Design a protein around this ligand. Structure first.
Ligand code: CA
Length: 99
């Protein structure tokens, strides 16, 4: 419910490769009143409407997203979790392309 952390801050991507990107972020301002336990990473190709889980329960401020396809544009969103589930998502600023 409303025990939701705020969004992670400064979601950014770098270190692009043939098949991966490296996301980094900072902790949310509000943890929802319960300690943060991890982050959840989702992705979607820009032309599809569906978000897809990449990894949950990430205990870091970063994640290398694997198995990305050359020629596709991708979006990513990260949410912080606490014991009551994930909070509001942070979004990348622009899609990631591949080549
Ligand atoms: Ca680390």
């Amino acid at each position: 419910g409303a025990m939701e952390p705020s969004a992670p801050k400064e979601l950014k991507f770098g270190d692009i490769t043939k098949d991966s990107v490296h996301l980094t972020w900072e902790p949310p301002d509000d943890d929802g009143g319960s300690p943060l336990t991890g982050y959840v990473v989702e992705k979607r190709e820009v032309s599809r409407k569906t978000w897809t889980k990449v990894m949950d329960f990430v205990t870091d401020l970063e994640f290398t997203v694997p198995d990305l396809v050359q020629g596709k544009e991708y979006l990513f969103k990260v949410c912080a979790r606490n014991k009551c589930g994930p909070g509001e998502p942070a979004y990348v600023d622009e899609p990631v392309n591949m080549s």
